[PDB]
Amino acid sequence: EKQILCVGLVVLDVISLVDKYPKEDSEIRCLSQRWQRGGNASNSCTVLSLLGAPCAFMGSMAPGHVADFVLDDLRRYSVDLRYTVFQTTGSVPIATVIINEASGSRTILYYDRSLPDVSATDFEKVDLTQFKWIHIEGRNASEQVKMLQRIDAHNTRQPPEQKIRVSVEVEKPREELFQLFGYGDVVFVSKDVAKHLGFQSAEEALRGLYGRVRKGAVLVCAWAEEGADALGPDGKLLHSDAFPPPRVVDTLGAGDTFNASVIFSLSQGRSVQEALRFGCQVAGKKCGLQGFDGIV
Amino acid sequence: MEEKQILCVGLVVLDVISLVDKYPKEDSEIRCLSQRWQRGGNASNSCTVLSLLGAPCAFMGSMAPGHVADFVLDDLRRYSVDLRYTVFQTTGSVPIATVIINEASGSRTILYYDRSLPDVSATDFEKVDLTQFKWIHIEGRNASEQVKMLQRIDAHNTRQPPEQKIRVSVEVEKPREELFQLFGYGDVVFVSKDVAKHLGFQSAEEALRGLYGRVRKGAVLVCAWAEEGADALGPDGKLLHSDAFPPPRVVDTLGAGDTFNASVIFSLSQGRSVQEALRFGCQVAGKKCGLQGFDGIV
Ligand SMILES: CS(=O)(=O)c1cccc2[nH]c3c(c12)CCCc1ccc(CN2CC[C@](O)(c4ccccc4)C2)cc1-3
Ligand SMILES: CS(=O)(=O)c1cccc2[nH]c3c(c12)CCCc1ccc(CN2CC[C@](O)(c4ccccc4)C2)cc1-3
């Protein structure tokens, strides 16, 4: 059966759950601490798996103890490991995450490991007949554009029913990533990217950036407690309010939960308006739980 | 018979250090300057310093087998710390502490995670042949069990001539009510600035005057107060002081308190006066604050 492919990076999150944000130069006792497999594309596979959609993860990996944890973690979620790109240099990146249970905040201290990125040559090895949807987490944009051109070229030879749907996420405010707006059926732009571009709402960001998307594409922008908006070729702005839980305890991976839920809903043939609502409902539910498991 | 060792009873921690250029704002993503794995724990860090200073030492702590235990045991072993009294546990794991070191300000922020590792009990301590040690330092943790260990040392000392008596030090570093009974034990009592402030004291002198009535007859109460230096108070009621010796650039204060304690113990265990030991404690700890880790102190 056709799967959803997620192309991105896997990070190991070292999470410290606290009752208050630590003051500089103090010693605080953690409520709990845990290891969790992170990374945008990687979190989206976890959510797609929990929602019941067969999915695969394509990312760079370096052999060892961290890879054993990560691959074992993916296996627990039946996330297909076929396209794992093993590297001979670098390590899996580690992120230190402070989660403030009282405010719901997540603070990340990121450590780059010098792990080589998935290249266009690595992607050429992917048998595209096995996938109905391919999601690409924007990172090494010049290589990723070649991957997207490979998908576009495959799609020209397929009937409309057999075309692979594509989504791209532009989550970091890096100039190199903005070329990715012109690719994919669904383009996810983060609130962080929108604010760095001068936009003060999801609606402003969509109207201001729609000119950059491919003909027929849907541009999506989640705006935390203000909910999420989308804009398609008909010019109709779509919106869903946020659905915050009674107590916000964990926002780590909330954006990834939203993206996976929108992809899931759209792949099942739901409207963009239904997909936005579903995204907000699942991410909102996630924000009231530690991790992802409790969403189901 | 060989030179007698200094035994440190405490816990070994794995420090997961994030070196940063600024203190992270809540809900933001920051890139670390570097990240490293370092063996921590108060008594464990004091062993590192005693070893670097050249004093033979031994560490008694709980351990759970695994990758973390292999890293911390190999690290202690590189410092020739005697580990024959390591208590291997069948439940729990070696604790992990997340440390944020702000290179710009010289701060250290600790997020500590108790990994349900059982503590060293009084029954575990009963197995220690005390004839090996000239000094026993106890990092306050499971106080009711530790009080029994201290009573065992006191009982051993009643049967020994004054030259053969084992000197004892205790550290009360965490502001936990259970630990305050430990002030009544040991020849030397270390009280942290954190404990003193939690108890309402605003200076080392106030803390020493305010807490001296709780120490054993003849004990020396010691309190280091970061950039204000360190003070000590003994049975004559004379408050002793050393100013701090700050480095030109304060880069790493993680384990500075442990550097001070080990240096004071080292100095007193070598017949130096309390005044000489305070000065030495500030000199070594002040030097440590100017460098990442402990090795550069020598
Ligand atoms: C798809 S979605 O569901 O729209 C979504 C996607 C991505 C991220 C998201 N964040 C949040 C939502 C959300 C929406 C519902 C839950 C929620 C409640 C409260 C806050 C606001 N809080 C969270 C810490 C906070 O940002 C903070 C900052 C600094 C100090 C203390 C707290 C202030 C955000 C969200
Ligand atoms: C045995 S000892 O040597 O007395 C000692 C024992 C234990 C801890 C120690 N800390 C420091 C010393 C020290 C003494 C000399 C070096 C020094 C210089 C400057 C500061 C002050 N800095 C360090 C972060 C700081 O306290 C901070 C607080 C909040 C925000 C940002 C930084 C502001 C402390 C020390």
Swiss-Prot record, chain A:
Keywords: ATP-binding, Carbohydrate metabolism, Disease variant, Kinase, Nucleotide-binding, Transferase
Binding site residues for ATP: 224-227, 253-256
Database matches in Pfam families: PfkB
Tissue-wise expression: Most abundant in liver, kidney, gut, spleen and pancreas. Low levels also found in adrenal, muscle, brain and eye.
Catalytic activity: beta-D-fructose + ATP = beta-D-fructose 1-phosphate + ADP + H(+)
A GO CC term attached to the entry: cytoplasm
Residues the entry annotates as binding beta-D-fructose: 13, 39-40, 43, 256
One of the record's GO molecular function terms: protein homodimerization activity
Activity regulation: Requires potassium. Inhibition by ADP.
Enzyme Commission (EC) number: 2.7.1.3
CDD domains: Ketohexokinase
SUPFAM superfamilies for this protein: Ribokinase-like
GO biological process: fructose metabolic process; regulation of glycogen metabolic process; response to fructose; response to glucose; response to insulin; response to sucrose; response to zinc ion
Pathway stated in the Swiss-Prot or TrEMBL entry: Carbohydrate metabolism; fructose metabolism
UniProt disease annotation: Fructosuria: Benign defect of intermediary metabolism.
Protein family (similarity comment): Belongs to the carbohydrate kinase PfkB family.
Protein task: Catalyzes the phosphorylation of the ketose sugar fructose to fructose-1-phosphate.
Database matches in PANTHER family: KETOHEXOKINASE, PHOSPHOTRANSFERASE SYSTEM TRANSPORT PROTEIN
Subunit structure: Homodimer.
Protein name: Ketohexokinase
Organism: Homo sapiens (Human)
Taxon lineage: Eukaryota, Metazoa, Chordata, Craniata, Vertebrata
Gene: KHK
From Swiss-Prot, chain B:
Pathway: Carbohydrate metabolism; fructose metabolism
Keywords, alphabetical: ATP-binding, Carbohydrate metabolism, Disease variant, Kinase, Nucleotide-binding, Transferase
The keyword Kinase belongs to this UniProt entry's keyword annotation: yes
Residues annotated as binding ATP: 226-229, 255-258
Organism expressing this protein natively: Homo sapiens
Effect of residue 40 to R: In FRUCT; loss of ketohexokinase function; insoluble
Listed InterPro entries: Ketohexokinase-related (IPR052562), KHK (IPR034093), PfkB_dom (IPR011611), Ribokinase-like (IPR029056)
Annotated gene: KHK
Tissue and organ distribution: Most abundant in liver, kidney, gut, spleen and pancreas. Low levels also found in adrenal, muscle, brain and eye.
UniProt name for this protein: Ketohexokinase
Catalytic activity reported: beta-D-fructose + ATP = beta-D-fructose 1-phosphate + ADP + H(+)
Pfam families the record matches: PfkB
The family this protein is said to belong to: Belongs to the carbohydrate kinase PfkB family.
PANTHER family: KETOHEXOKINASE, PHOSPHOTRANSFERASE SYSTEM TRANSPORT PROTEIN
E.C. designation(s): 2.7.1.3
Coiled-coil segments on the chain, per record: none
GO CC field: cytoplasm; cytosol; extracellular exosome
Self-association state and partner proteins as the record states: Homodimer.
GO terms under biological process: fructose metabolic process; regulation of glycogen metabolic process; response to fructose; response to glucose; response to insulin; response to sucrose; response to zinc ion
Record bears the keyword Transmembrane: no
Primary enzyme class: transferase
Function: Catalyzes the phosphorylation of the ketose sugar fructose to fructose-1-phosphate.
Activity control note: Requires potassium. Inhibition by ADP.
GO MF, one example: ketohexokinase activity
Record CDD domains: Ketohexokinase (cd01939)
